[PDB]
C-alpha cells in the first residue's frame, strides 16, 4: 500500500547470553552491588 | 402521674452495665432496645444487621502500622532543559532513561548519575519509555503522534509505530508476549505488534484522554483509565472491556501494579484507590494526599509513593493505608514557587532508591535513612477510631 | 557598601544553599557517551 | 495503489498525518491547550460549575502575550492556583 | 395472552435473602452482567464487606499463566 | 400565647429560608414541593381499612415479598394534577427567570465586566 | 416540508458540537410540540449516550414525558436514572415525590428502602419520617426512627426520636427511648443539651423527683469546666 | 393551489437522508422493570390524532393569521 508500511526488520531480537537476560538478573544480587557501585562513586 | 418512681438505679444501671470500652462508640447496645414497641419482625433485623455491617466496617480500619522508615534526598541530577516527564529502569539496574519536554531521551547511570549518551529523534515532548526485560529495545512515545523502537545495540530508531489521531500519553509492554500497548489523547488505547508493526486491536471504549496504562500476564491484561474518571479492564483477546470501575471522581492519572500482591492501586484529584485484580473489587481508600497525584509506585516491601503536581510526596504504608511520611519537593534555584511539580517516578529494580522526574527540569533520587531505629525516627502518629469512613 | 555591577549580580542561591550539604549536585549539560 | 484508489474511494477518515515541520507549532499549541484544559478541570473542586475553561484559556493566551512584550500581567481577581497553574505553563511555553 | 415479555423480568428474591434486586437494569447488556457493580456493597472495601472470609491476594500461580499465555 | 407560638415558628422558618450547592438546593426544592402538597382523600382510608378484614396471608402494607406494586395503575385525578403542579411549576420558572455598549452583547459583556471588576 | 427543513437544521447542529446539549434539549422540546413520541425518545437518549452524566438532560427527560401523561414510562426512565447516578438526590427526590403525590405509597415505600439503601444524609430520612407522618402509621415510623439512630448516631437524631414519640403519646416509652440514647451514646458523646432536652420532658410531665435527680446526675457526669447551661437549667427547675 | 395546481412538490437535493421517512438514527428506550404494554398500544389511536389535531390547529392558526393581514391591516 505505502512505502512505509512494507515489510522491515521481520526478525524480532532478543537479548543474548551476556547480555542481561531474566535468568542472570534473578541470579545476580542488584542490592549490595548498587550499594558497592554508590560507594566506590562516592570514594572519586 | 408517678405510676413508678426511684429512677436513682435506672439512671446509673441502663449507662453504667455494658462494655465499658467504647466499640464503634455508636453501638445501641443491644440488649437494651429490644424493650421498646414498633417492628421488630422486619425493622429489628435490619438494624441489627446495619449496626454488624457498621462494627465490622469500624473494626476492620484499625489496622496498626508498621514503621518502613522514612526517606531522604540523596542526589539532584539537573540536565534536562524542559519539564522530564517519563522515566523507566533498565532491567539490570544500570540506568535509567528519561524523556523530557526538550525533545530529548537522556540516558543516566543510576549509581553516579553521569549522563550517558542522549537520544534525539522527537518533534515534541517524550511521555513514556519503557526499556524492555527481553529484547535489546527501548521503546518511547510522544506528543509528536508517532510511536518508535530505539535498537540499544546501535542507538537509532528502527521501528515506527504510526496510527494514532492526537499525542501519545503512556506506553507498556506485555510482560510475556512480544506485544506493547499505547495510550493517548484519541480516547483509544491501541495493541501494537513489537515485530510487525501492526495495530492489532483497537480498545476503544472511553470518551477522552486515556491519560494511564497498566498491562501483566494474567486476564485482565491491559487496565486503562481516562478523563472520564472511569477505569476500565480489558481483554488483550478479544479487545473488549470486562469491568468499569467508576469509583472516581476526577481523571485518573496514576495507575500501578503491586509486584507481589495481585491487586492494583489508581490515584487521582480526590482519592487514591486500590482494588482486588480479577474482578476489580474495591479494598480501601489512601486519604490524606489532597493534591492532584500523577504517580504511584509500590515497593517490594509494601512501600507505597505518591507524587503530586505541586511537590508533595506521601508515602503510604500498602497494608494499612496509613501515610507515614509528608514530604514537599524543593525547587532548584532557577525556578518558581509554582514550578514545583512532580510528572513521573519509579522505584529501581531493587526498590531502595526512588526516582523522581519533576516538573522542574530536574530528576531527584530518594534514599531510604540508614541508621534506622525506630525509636529515633517515628513515622506520622496514628489515631486509631476516631469516627467511621463516609463512604 | 560595595557596589553590585549587572554582569557581577546573582539573582538565586546556590544549589548548595538550597540543598543542603548531604546531597550531591550535578549539572550534566555535556554528554560522556 | 491507483486502481485501488480509483475502484474504492478515498477512505480519508481514520488516517493520521504526521506532523510535518509546518504544523508543529499549532500542534504543540493544541497540545498544550488540551492539558490546561485538564489541569481546570482537575483542580477546580466538585460542583463549582466547571464551564469556566475557555476564561481562562484567554487569560493564558494573554499572560503569553504579555510575556512576549515584557508586561507584567498582574490580574487582581484571578484566583491563586490559576495564576500559579498559568505561570507554569507559559514558563513552559517561553523555555521552549 | 400474547403480551410475551414486553418488559423485563421483575426483580429477584436473591439467594442471600436480599429482598429484592434492582441491579437488572445496570446488568442489562455489558455482556459481563456478573462483573457489573450496581449495589452500596460495591463501595465497601473488600476488608470489610461481611460476607468474607479469606481474600486470596496471589497471583494465579503457573498453570493459569502459561493457559492464559497460550489462548 | 398560641398565636405567639406561630409567629415564633413563622420567624424561626423565616432566618432559615435567608444558592449553596445542587445537594441542598435538590432537598429545598422537594421540601417546597411538600409545601405545596394536599394528601389524605378519601382513597387511601379506605384502602387501608378495606382489604385488611380479609388479611387471610401477608399485609396489606407489608413490601419484604410484596408482588402487586408493579401493577398499581391510578386513576384520571391524579394524573391531572401531576400535570397541573408540573405546568404550574414551569410558568413559575419562566416567571421567575425573566451608554458604555455598541451592541446588546457588549452591554451584557460590560454588566458581566463592572460585576467583577468594580470592586478593584 | 417545514418538519424536514427544522429537522436538517437542527440535525447539522447538533452534529457539529455534539457536545452542545442545549441544542438537543430545543430539538426535542421543538419536535415534542407536534409528534409527542417515538423519536423524541430517541433524539433524548441519543443525546444521554453522548452524556448521561448531565442531570439537566434527566430532569428536561422526565418533565417532557410526564407533560403528555405517560407515567410508566417516566417510571422506567427514572429506574434508569437511579441506578445510574444513586449517589445524586435530586433524581430521588423527584421520584418519591412523584411517586407519593401519585398516591401509590406502597410503592413509594419500597423507593425510599431502595434509595436508604445507600446510607443517605439525614434530610432524605427526614423526608421520609414527613412522608410516614402525612399518613399516621407511626407504628412502622418508630422502626425507621430506629433505622435513622443506627445508620447515624448523633444526638440530634435522638432527640427527634424523641419528639416523635412524645407527640405518638406515651411516657415510658419517651424515658425508655432516652436511656436507650443514653446507653449508645455513652460518656464521649453526651452532651448537656441532651440532658437538658430529657428534663424538660419530665417537667412536661409533671414527675419531679425524676427531674431533680437527673439535674444531680448530670452535675456530677460532666466536668464542672463545661457546666453552665446545665447548672442554669437546674436552676431553673428547682426554683421553677 | 389558488386557481388550479399542477401540485407542486418541493425540491430535495441528491444526497441526503431527508430525515422524513424514518427516525435519523433509529434508537429505542431501554425496556425496564415496569412493562409499558398499554401505556403505548392501548393508545396507538392517540399517537396518530395527537398528532392529527396538532396538524390540524397548525393550519387552522396559519389560516386565521393569513386572514389576519386583512384583519389587522389598519388596526
Known sequence: TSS????????????????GTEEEVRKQDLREALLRAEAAHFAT | TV?????????????????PNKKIAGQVSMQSLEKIKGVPEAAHRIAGESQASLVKRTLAEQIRPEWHAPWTLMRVISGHLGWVRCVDVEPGNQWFCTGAGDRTIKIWDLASGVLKLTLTGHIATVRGLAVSPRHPYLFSCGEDKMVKCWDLETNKVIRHYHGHLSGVYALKLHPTLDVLVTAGRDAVARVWDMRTRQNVHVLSG?????????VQEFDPQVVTGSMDSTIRLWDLAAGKTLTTLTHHKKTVRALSLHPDEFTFASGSSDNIKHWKFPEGAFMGNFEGHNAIVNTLSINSDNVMFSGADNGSMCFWDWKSGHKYQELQSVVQPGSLDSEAGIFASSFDKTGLRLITCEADKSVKIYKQVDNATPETHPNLPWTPSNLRRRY | NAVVLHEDKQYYPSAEEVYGSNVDIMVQEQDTQ | NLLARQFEGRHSTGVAKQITKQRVDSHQDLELRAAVMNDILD??????RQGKSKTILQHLSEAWRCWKANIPW????????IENMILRYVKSKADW | RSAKSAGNTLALQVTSSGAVDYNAIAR??????????????????????????????????????????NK | ?????????????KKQTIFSDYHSQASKDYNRGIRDLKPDYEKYDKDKKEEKSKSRSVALYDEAERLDWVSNKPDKEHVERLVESIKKQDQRRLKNTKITFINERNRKFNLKLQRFYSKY | EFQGRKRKEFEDAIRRNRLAMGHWMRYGQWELDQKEFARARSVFERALDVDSTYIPLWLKYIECEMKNRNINHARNLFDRAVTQLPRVDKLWYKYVYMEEMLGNITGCRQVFERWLKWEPDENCWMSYIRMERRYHENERARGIYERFVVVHPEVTNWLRWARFEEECGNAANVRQVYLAAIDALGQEFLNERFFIAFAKFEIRQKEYERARTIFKYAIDFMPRSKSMELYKEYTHFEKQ | KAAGINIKLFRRKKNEMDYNASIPFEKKPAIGFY???????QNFREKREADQKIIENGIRNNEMESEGRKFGHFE
Open chain 1, 4 to 19: 512505509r508500511a512494507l515489510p522491515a526488520h521481520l526478525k524480532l531480537k532478543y537479548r543474548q547470553e551476556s547480555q
Open chain 2, 3 to 19: 405510676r413508678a418512681d426511684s429512677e436513682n438505679p435506672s439512671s446509673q444501671v441502663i449507662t453504667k452495665f455494658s462494655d
Open chain 2, 206 to 214: 472511553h470518551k477522552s484522554t486515556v491519560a494511564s496504562l497498566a
Open chain 4, 43 to 48: 483542580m477546580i473542586p466538585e460542583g463549582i
Open chain 4, 74 to 81: 498582574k490580574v487582581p481577581g484571578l484566583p491563586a492556583p
Open chain 5, 28 to 69: 442489562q447488556g455489558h455482556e459481563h452482567g456478573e462483573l457489573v457493580q450496581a449495589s452500596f456493597r460495591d463501595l465497601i472495601p473488600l476488608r470489610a464487606r461481611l460476607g468474607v472470609g479469606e481474600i486470596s491476594l496471589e497471583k494465579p500461580s503457573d498453570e493459569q499463566k502459561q493457559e492464559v499465555a
Open chain 6, 1 to 13: 400565647i398560641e398565636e405567639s407560638e406561630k409567629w415564633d415558628q413563622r420567624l424561626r422558618k
Open chain 8, 35 to 41: 412493562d409499558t404494554s398499554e401505556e403505548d398500544r
